[PDB]
Design a protein around this ligand. Structure first.
Ligand SMILES: [Mg+2]
Ligand SMILES: [Zn+2]
Lengths: 39, 82, 94, 104, 222, 13, 1114, 263
DNA sequence: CTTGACAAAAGTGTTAAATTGTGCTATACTGGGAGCCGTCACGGATGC
DNA sequence: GCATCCGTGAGTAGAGAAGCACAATTTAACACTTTTGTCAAG
């Protein structure tokens, strides 16, 4: 989000979960969201 | 070992976060018998207790930072090492 | 965007340290009624009011602009907390 | 001091009786006419605390100066009414019963 | 007896208690069979349990039997008049000592409490408890204005004399929390019950003059 | 699983 | 303003009554008008004949007849007094002493049957309600293939819902057929022996298929007698019970052979005979006669299953989603089913009452207790999922609600169990259920609407009409026919060309079992009546439906329901032809019963002198508040002395213009971006709309208060409220209620009420306060009703109901209730939601002055500016064609009727545009004006974009642009033209019920929860906003630790923190450090109630008390 | 067990569960004292075990216990803590908050990236405790309690109150949230600009991050109170400080729709 | 500032009605009642 | 190894149906001092 080294203290785990989950509804749904869920 | 996100989350040390996710009866049953002591490491545990999360401004790496002006700084310095 | 936000982010190793410094300075300014400010009278933040041009009451705005000047010293274990609070009260009565 | 850890463990029967301020012996809740809690019931002021701050059930004490005092007549401690959110009771079972969590 | 507030197993166990009492009081010298006499005690125990255990707010047997009579009478009037009876009609059919006021109060008493977990709407995500405010704990506004009044009152009492302010704080219970008598104050200072009433009014009068001059205390009166 | 049926069996003996 | 009608398809029959699904079904159930001796065995009449006679086993209670009396109160009285519009029910019963032989007859009062209004709704507790029809799997016998193992099929026997167990017949791998009852699997051989079947009978009937019969010939039980085989089966069904012949026969009879407990249903029985090729005597799986069991359906069911497994040509599996296998339970059936349940409960109470207590002297009045009957009826009309609060925002809203079909409800489905199959558009929905109309979201495919021409038959199957085609000529014979019957014919499309009645096209588009095929005219057997039968009423009101994507047509039809009535509502310029029928069938307007002359015309009533001479006075509903708060009023449309024919309009109803449905306004629309105020569906409107009061609606809000009996004294509704000045009480009359006509604002008193204060000594600070001022504390406090924030208006009605009033059944302890109606005239403002019929919706984001809006060269400004970027992705081109047709009608002064799929095409629209150009521009030439310099510049760009032909005169090029729906548009801000021609036309836009006035809410501090001590939710309760888990995740990701902690503690449930924070802020101080939330304290105590020792520790593992020593025993 | 304004009492399901346990426990004590046969004692002890089970976890074993007259299972202790409606997910991991509001959003084309249009009526309620202090500092009201009485009635609100509200919100920011909050930019901080009307004006360039359009969407407004909360929002959560997507590093606040088309 | 004495306010001891709790009904009566149903995948255990 | 039943989970906002007798306990109506509180007197 800042194009610079991450700052110590950022909850990157929450960011990672939101980053993966946010486009979940844009998947066409072994294909699409079901493929992601089983992985 | 490789486990899914659901099983990995339910096997975490902190029983507060695991009980608040799923299988509350199962998580609390094993935690109470084992006498588990939640150390409040993750974010969810401090949210439940209304504590400052150990991330961002709540992280110990920046939370204890002090701010002072030069006039106050010199006044403290000139009064101690004198 | 906040004025000089790029310069504010460049003075700290972690972006959350900047917020801690600004917020702690803001309450120092609020506690002493802005009498401990390092800003010159021509540098004090101002707001436009119908009666006239008056001082900005938002201490967060003051704290950010103070840090841009460079007259504030921030860090960890600079001075004891009890010594800091007592000394500021003496030299800035409130 | 600061809260740093949270521990969960089984509660012994002795520990449960240590938590409780009294045994709930009757299934009554409140009087149908006065709407006031019944003695030895699920809402008894003698067990869980006064309905209103610093006032006993009978009405002998109605002031904060008697903090920590238990009225000799009514048996209700003169304290803040917020203790009814924290003070617990207990039911002495005639026969032991298994906790369903550790069974099913 | 099912459907009257108690489960089937509760009815049986209560009925068993009456059966035990039947055995103790049964007499075979009368040559009556056991079921003839036991039925009275089994039904008695079930009836008493319903009158004692079928309601969250317990109602005595006399009022339960009164509530039962009122419903039976109202139902009989309903089927004869072809409509819901009025309270005057029900009271008249009940007999002497009954008016429409008593019928309404009895119906008000017969109101069972409603569950806090009763859902609203098709969705199973709302209950009655989510719409009931807590009226016991003071609101942040009420707590603040109490603190504002306390600091303005002690500020006004500062203008009083050292003893004059003490008397009002002691008579009105601003220190110990309890209103004291002019006597209970006559022992703290060793003065006469008329001494206090003499000054307590004088200190009261001076606060009235101060309040009229500043008007920093009227808004708290509401 | 049925307490009522269990009781009726017990009294049936 | 003439109306031009498009279309080529001639509809032989009109639309059926749009509320007949409600009205006719409830009439059939009640049978209130038919004499008792001619009542058929349906409805509640069937319920009486099923539960009765009640036999003690020598006392019999028999049913002879019933009757329904007149309702105690009229419909308006029930609404005003919060009563139920219902009719008393009396049953004429006789008690028969089989021993003595004496019969006594009397009429007993069974309670009240709620009555349906003329429009098709009910008034339950003073509130209008609609019973939504329910769709489910039809009863009968079904044969579905086993998914686990290929080549095997399972037989399913389904009775009426809650009227018997579901039965499964499956061929086990061992070869023996199994019967599953109540989750208990057992071999059908045992039960088949119970019903009197030998070894030779099974072989003689089922032995001509193959090895299947060999698995049905276990001789271990064939030699066993049926009586013990009945007991042997009784052990498998419910094991443990003592085997007794009397008890065993009752259980088996009550399971498959008792009409009182098992009911296959009229639809189920008909399906069973049609599928298995048999004839059932009753509606049970077996009959119990002559002390023995006789088979009814099991043998044909097993015969079909064996033949299906073998592979005979005449046997096929059943599609459970096929609309011939799905039926509709209407209001009559739903009420009858609940009536039967209550009647069964009443019969059980009668049976237990007639076996004890003065046996010789008993009367039917004493034995019958009608409360169980009334309780079931009251429960169905109040607390049922299918009994819904009537949606009456506009007359179309009520019409849609009565035609809704729901797969949910008691006995239906739940979303969890609703998959892509029940939620999908089956091929048999054609002409029976609208394919596009459905609530998007979690209810997609579960709540649907009946098709316009569709009707529900007696058995509950939806039928759609088709025109009979014989010998290639299309006749006027219309056959209403079900989906299963539709599969047997080749049905052509309604758009097939015809030369008179002969089919003209050699290739005909047709459907064979739902599949599109090309057939010859001689192969066509039926024809579609019209394109309108495929869609519902709401979808049929969308012009140019064929040009809109289905996803956006869904939105357009749904939002027509949300349109609010307008004081100047207009019928759309482009209509589909159903606008008049919707108003007529909604009963919101008033029409002449026969030919006559109007005698008196007034805003309150209309009097018409009919030809027969009788004077009929029609009161006019004026400023009535609907369930949604919209004002429903009828405005007279006739004058004194005017001659009216039968069916002529007398008074327009809500959202109607001269008998035509008027859900919005006809405004001039420019399709062009405007300075970002059109960004992402936002809408720009002109201030001229507000000047002439378009999109202005009247809304009425109801406020209620009760004066109660209290233990401290009764609450008094009075004008004398303590500690308030005259200004606050200025608008209150002597009785304490606000005067009618007063303007009320938030914080103003609507009615004054004083309540006795709870006995509690005051705080010493207050005691000194009263002592200083010499003011004695009063015994009453202000508990009056005030206007909530963001509300107000004009007081138009005050309703005061007092205890003892005739028909007012107040709750005990309530002396009186006062209801105040406040009406506000709402104009269109920023944030209000506008929409059209094509799914284009948006909120008003900017209101411009008239001089700022784009305008035509003649000086006419546009009314609405729409963003063209909302068209391409949504693929709803009907709004564009409506705009083009609206532009032509704006200058020609005419409206249009274009039926869906058969209406105005572009060649017809362009030729209308050519005529509209001759008045658009020919008028300019006569006035002495040539071509604008600004127009010349636009035409120079237009030929560069390929929009006009080079080399033509400016007049011809302007005409070319006009035929495309585009005009030269000037910018009101600059005066310069828009660099390209803009599509400008007249389009019908609706104002929706979602208004920013009713949705804006804010709270600093307010009520808190009882247990969690957290703020409540909802604007009505002045609650806070929910900061859920995902919002917490957002702050965690941002690293805003202190912002998160405030919301968790300081602003939600830190009782000490929130009190200190508020006090600090009002003193100009910073809020203090927060503390532990009260919800965590609740969790710990609840965990302790679960016998769990939860303790908070410190760095040194020592216990830390978070309860401040308030829970520690000394 | 609370009396509602109507006068009827409302109670939780736990009280009925507790009463059943006490009723069965007390009956067992009398049955034991009377020397009842083992069959009667066996049934009572079995019912006591089921009463304990229903109180702790209703429906876990056997048929759920329901109150007479309804089929609704009683809410036991396990149900209170578990599930989406349980204590953890409804009151601990998320809460309803004070100083919060909600309104329909409209496009603010003239707004700056860090600015939002906040209705004055919402801001008066959202910043009421701050406004009461500001009104007391000026000559609008003698004290806070009198100031609050003025704001209770709309027709008693002077025009000088609105001028004081502007000084309250100077430099302060508010939090705008649109549900669902799929990522962290579903909550952003904006400097509120007081506007006439009832709708929130939203910057066009932040619509993509919020996944917000203007066909009826609504947003929640939140007020950070302390210096830490204000500093975090102005530095870390400000819209103009969050221009790149945390998921990919690409610009998330970027030209779209009419802005691209015009350029 | 003490009388002082004096009426109101409050406390207090009886006594009555009123409300509430408990016992007892003697032909013979002896094993309940309602449901019963259109999801799907996933562990995890429990046995085969 | 495998087949089966049980348990778990499945987006977020907002708006929405016996009397009766008798004893035992409690309430409420009295009287009674006894007590504060108060307005004359110095
Ligand atoms: Mg939207
Ligand atoms: Zn006491």
């Amino acid at each position: 989000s800042m194009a610079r080294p991450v700052s110590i203290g950022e909850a990157v785990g929450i960011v990672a979960a939101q980053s993966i989950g946010e486009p979940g509804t844009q998947l066409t749904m072994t294909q699409g969201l079901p493929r992601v869920i089983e992985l | 070992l490789l486990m899914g996100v659901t099983k990995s989350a339910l096997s975490t040390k902190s029983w507060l976060s695991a009980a608040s996710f799923q299988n509350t009866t199962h998580v609390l049953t094993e935690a109470a018998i084992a006498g588990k002591k939640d150390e409040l490491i993750g974010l969810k545990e401090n949210v439940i207790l209304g504590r400052l999360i150990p991330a961002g401004t709540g992280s110990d790496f920046v939370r204890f930072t002090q701010v002072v002006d030069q006039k106050t700084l010199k006044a403290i310095e000139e009064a101690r090492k004198e | 965007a906040e004025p000089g936000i790029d310069k504010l982010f460049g003075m700290v190793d972690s972006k959350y340290r900047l917020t801690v410094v600004v917020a702690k300075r803001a309450q120092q300014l609020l506690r002493h009624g802005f009498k401990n400010t390092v800003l010159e009278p021509e540098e004090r933040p101002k707001m436009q009011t119908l009666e006239g041009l008056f001082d900005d009451p938002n201490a967060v705005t003051w704290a950010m602009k103070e840090l841009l000047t460079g007259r504030l010293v921030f860090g960890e274990n600079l001075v004891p907390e009890d010594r800091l609070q007592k000394e500021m009260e003496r030299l800035y009565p409130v | 001091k600061e809260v740093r850890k949270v521990r969960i463990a089984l509660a012994s029967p002795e520990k449960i009786r240590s938590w409780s301020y009294g045994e709930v012996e009757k299934p009554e809740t409140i009087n149908y006419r006065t709407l006031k809690p019944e003695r030895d019931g699920l809402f008894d002021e003698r067990i869980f605390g006064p309905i209103k701050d610093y006032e006993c059930a009978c009405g002998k004490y109605k002031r904060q100066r008697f903090e920590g005092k238990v009225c000799e007549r009514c048996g209700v401690e003169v304290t803040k009414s917020i203790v009814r959110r924290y003070r617990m009771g207990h039911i002495e079972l005639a026969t032991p019963a298994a906790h369903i969590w550790f069974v099913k | 007896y099912t459907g009257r507030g108690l489960s089937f197993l509760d009815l049986i166990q209560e009925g068993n208690q009456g059966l035990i009492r039947a055995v103790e009081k049964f007499e075979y010298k009368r040559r009556f069979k056991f079921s003839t006499y036991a039925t009275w005690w089994i039904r008695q125990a079930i009836n008493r349990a319903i009158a004692d255990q079928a309601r969250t707010i317990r109602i005595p047997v006399h009022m339960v039997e009164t509530i039962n009579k009122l419903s039976r009478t109202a139902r009989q009037l309903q089927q004869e008049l072809g409509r819901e009876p009025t309270y005057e009609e029900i009271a008249e059919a009940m007999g002497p000592g009954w008016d429409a006021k008593r019928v309404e109060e009895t119906l008000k008493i017969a109101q069972e409490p409603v569950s806090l977990e009763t859902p609203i709407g098709d969705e199973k995500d709302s209950f009655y408890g989510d719409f009931i405010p807590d009226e016991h704990l003071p609101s942040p506004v009420d707590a603040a204005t109490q603190s504002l009044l306390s600091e303005e009152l002690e500020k006004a009492l500062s203008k009083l004399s050292e003893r004059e302010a003490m008397v009002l704080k002691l008579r009105k219970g601003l220190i110990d929390g309890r209103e004291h008598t002019l006597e209970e104050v006559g022992a703290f200072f060793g003065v006469t019950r008329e001494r206090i009433r003499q000054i307590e009014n004088k200190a009261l009068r001076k606060l009235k003059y101060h309040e009229s001059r500043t008007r920093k205390l009227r808004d708290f009166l509401d | 699983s049925d307490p009522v049926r269990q009781y009726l069996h017990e009294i049936g003996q | 303003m003439e109306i031009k009608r498009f279309g080529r398809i001639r509809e032989v029959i009109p639309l059926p009554p749009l509320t007949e699904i409600q009205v006719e079904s409830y009439r059939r159930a009640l049978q209130a008008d038919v004499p008792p001796e001619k009542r058929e065995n349906v409805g509640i009449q069937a319920a009486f004949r099923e539960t009765f006679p009640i036999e003690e086993e020598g006392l019999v209670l028999d049913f002879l007849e019933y009757r329904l009396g007149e309702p105690p109160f009229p419909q308006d009285e029930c609404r005003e007094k919060d009563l139920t519009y219902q009719a008393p029910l009396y049953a004429r019963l006789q008690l028969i002493h089989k021993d003595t032989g004496l019969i006594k007859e009397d009429e007993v009062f069974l309670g009240h049957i709620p009555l349906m209004t003329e429009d098709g709704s009910f008034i339950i507790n003073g509130a209008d309600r609609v019973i939504v029809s329910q769709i489910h799997r039809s009863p009968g016998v079904y044969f579905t293939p086993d998914p686990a193992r290929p080549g095997r099929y399972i037989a399913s026997i389904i009775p009426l819902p809650k009227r018997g167990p579901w039965i499964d017949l499956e061929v086990e791998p061992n070869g023996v057929v199994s019967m599953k009852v109540n989750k208990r699997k057992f071999p059908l051989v045992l039960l088949l022996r119970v019903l009197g079947y030998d070894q030779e009978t099974l072989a003689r009937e089922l032995g001509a298929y193959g090895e299947l019969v060999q698995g049905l010939m276990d001789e271990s039980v064939f030699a066993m007698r049926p009586e013990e085989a009945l007991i042997r089966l009784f052990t498998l069904l419910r094991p443990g019970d003592p085997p007794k012949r009397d008890k065993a026969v009752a259980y088996v009879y009550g399971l498959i052979a008792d009409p009182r407990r098992y009911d296959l249903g009229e639809a189920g029985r008909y399906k069973a005979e049609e599928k298995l090729g048999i004839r059932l005597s009753g509606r049970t799986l077996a009959r119990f006669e002559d002390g023995e069991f006789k088979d009814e359906v099991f043998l044909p069911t097993l015969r079909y299953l064996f033949a299906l497994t073998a592979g005979v040509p005449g046997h096929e599996v059943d599609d459970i989603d096929h609309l011939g296998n799905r039926r509709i339970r209407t209001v009559g059936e739903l009420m009858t089913d609940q009536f039967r349940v209550g009647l069964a409960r009443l019969a059980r109470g009668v049976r237990e009452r007639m076996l004890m207590g003065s046996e010789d002297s008993l009367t039917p009045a004493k034995l019958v207790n009608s409360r169980p009957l009334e309780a079931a009826i009251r429960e169905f009309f109040s607390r049922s999922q299918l009994s819904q609060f009537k949606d009456e925002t506009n007359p179309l809203s009520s019409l849609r609600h009565k035609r809704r079909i729901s797969a949910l409800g008691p006995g239906g489905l739940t979303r969890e169990r609703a998959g892509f199959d029940v939620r999908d558009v089956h091929r048999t929905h054609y002409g029976r259920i609208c394919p596009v109309e459905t609530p998007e979201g979690a209810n997609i495919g579960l709540i649907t609407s009946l098709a316009a021409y569709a009707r529900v038959d007696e058995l509950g199957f939806i039928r759609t009409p088709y025109r009979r085609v014989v010998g290639g000529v299309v006749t006027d014979e219309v056959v209403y026919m079900t989906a299963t019957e539709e599969d047997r014919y080749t049905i052509a499309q309604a758009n097939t060309p015809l030369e008179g009645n002969r089919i003209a096209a050699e290739r005909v588009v047709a459907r064979r079992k739902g599949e599109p095929v090309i057939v010859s005219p001689e192969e066509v057997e039926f024809m579609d009546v019209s394109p309108k039968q495929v869609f519902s009423v709401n979808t049929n009101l969308i012009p140019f439906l064929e040009h809109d994507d289905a996803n956006r047509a869904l939105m357009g039809s749904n939002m027509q329901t949300q349109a609010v009535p307008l004081i100047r509502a207009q019928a759309p310029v482009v209509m589909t032809g159903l606008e008049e029928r919707v108003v007529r069938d909604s009963l919101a307007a008033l029409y002449a019963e026969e030919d006559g002359e109007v005698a008196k015309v007034d805003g309150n009533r209309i009097v018409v002198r009919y030809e027969d001479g009788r004077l009929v006075e029609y009161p006019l509903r004026r400023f009535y508040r609907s369930n949604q708060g919209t004002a429903l009023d009828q405005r007279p449309r006739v004058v004194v002395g005017q001659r009216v024919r039968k069916g002529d309009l007398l008074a327009d109803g809500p959202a109607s213009e001269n008998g035509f449905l008027a859900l919005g306004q006809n405004v001039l629309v420019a399709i062009m971006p405007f300075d970002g105020y059109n960004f992402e569906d936002a809408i720009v409107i002109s201030e001229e709309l507000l000047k002439r009061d378009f999109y202005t609606s009247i809304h009425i809000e109801r406020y209620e208060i009760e004066a109660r009996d209290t233990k401290l004294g009764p609450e008094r509704i009075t004008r004398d409220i303590p500690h308030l000045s005259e200004a606050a009480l200025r608008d209150l009359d002597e009785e304490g209620v606000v005067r009618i006509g007063a303007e009320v604002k938030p914080g103003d008193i609507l009615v004054g009420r004083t309540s006795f204060k709870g006995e509690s000594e005051p705080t010493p600070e207050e005691r000194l306060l009263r002592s200083i001022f010499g003011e004695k504390a009063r015994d009453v406090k202000d508990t009056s009703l005030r206007v909530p924030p963001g509300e107000g208006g004009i007081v138009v009605r005050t309703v005061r109901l007092r205890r003892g009033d005739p028909g007012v059944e107040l709750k005990p302890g309530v002396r009186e209730v006062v209801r105040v109606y406040v009406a506000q005239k709402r104009k269109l403002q920023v944030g209000d939601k506008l929409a059209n019929r094509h799914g284009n919706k948006g909120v008003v984001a900017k209101i411009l002055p008239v001089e700022d809006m784009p305008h035509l060269p003649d000086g006419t400004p546009v009314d609405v500016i729409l963003n063209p970027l909302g068209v391409p992705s949504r693929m709803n081109l009907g709004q564009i064609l409506e705009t083009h047709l609206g532009l032509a009608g704006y200058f020609l002064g005419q409206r249009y009727i274009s039926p869906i799929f058969d209406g105005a095409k572009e060649p017809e629209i362009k030729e209308l545009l050519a005529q509209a150009f001759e008045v658009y521009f020919g008028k300019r030439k006569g006035e002495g004006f040539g071509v604008d310099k600004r127009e010349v510049e636009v035409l120079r760009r237009a030929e560069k974009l390929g929009l006009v032909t080079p080399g033509k005169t400016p007049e011809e090029q302007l005409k070319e642009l006009f035929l495309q729906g585009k005009v030269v548009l000037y910018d009101g801000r600059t005066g310069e033209p828009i660099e390209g021609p803009i599509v400008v036309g007249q389009m019908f836009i609706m104002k929706l019920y979602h208004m920013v006035e009713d949705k804006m809410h804010a709270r600093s501090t307010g009520p808190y929860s009882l247990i969690t001590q957290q703020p409540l939710g909802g604007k009505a309760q002045f609650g806070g906003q929910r900061f859920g888990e995902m919002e917490v995740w957002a702050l965690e990701a941002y690293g805003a630790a202190h912002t998160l902690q405030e919301m968790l503690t300081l602003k939600s449930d830190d009782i000490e923190g929130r009190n200190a924070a508020y006090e600090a802020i009002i003193k100009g101080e910073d809020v203090p450090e927060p503390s532990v939330p009260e919800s965590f304290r609740v969790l710990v105590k609840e965990l302790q109630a679960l016998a769990l020792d939860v303790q908070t520790l410190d760095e040194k593992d020592n216990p830390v008390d978070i309860f401040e020593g308030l829970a520690s025993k000394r | 067990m609370v009396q509602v304004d109507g006068g009827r009492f409302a109670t939780s399901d736990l009280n009925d569960l507790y009463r059943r346990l006490i009723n069965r426990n007390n009956r067992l004590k009398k049955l034991l004292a009377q020397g009842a046969p083992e069959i009667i004692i066996r049934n009572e002890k079995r019912m006591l075990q089921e009463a304990v089970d229903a109180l702790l976890d209703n429906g876990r074993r056997g048929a759920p216990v329901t109150n007479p007259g309804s089929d609704r299972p009683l809410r036991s202790l396990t149900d209170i803590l578990s599930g989406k409606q349980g204590r953890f997910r409804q009151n601990l991991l998320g809460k309803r908050v004070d100083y919060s509001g909600r309104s329909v959003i409209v496009v603010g084309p003239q707004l700056k990236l860090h600015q939002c249009g906040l209705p004055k009526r919402m801001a008066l309620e959202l910043f009421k405790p701050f406004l009461l202090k500001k009104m007391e500092e000026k000559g609008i009201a003698p004290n806070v309690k009198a100031a609050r009485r003025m704001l209770e009635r709309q027709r008693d609100i002077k025009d000088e109150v609105w001028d004081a509200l502007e000084e309250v919100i100077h430099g302060k920011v508010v939090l705008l949230n649109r549900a669902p909050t799929l990522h962290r930019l579903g909550i952003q901080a904006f400097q509120p600009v007081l506007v006439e009307g009832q709708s929130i004006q939203l910057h066009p360039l932040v619509c993509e991050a919020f996944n917000a359009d203007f066909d009826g969407d609504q947003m929640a407004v939140h007020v950070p109170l302390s210096s830490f909360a204000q500093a975090e929002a102005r530095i870390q959560m400000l819209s103009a400080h969050n221009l790149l997507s945390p998921a990919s590093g690409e610009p998330l606040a970027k030209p779209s729709r009419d802005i691209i088309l015009g350029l």
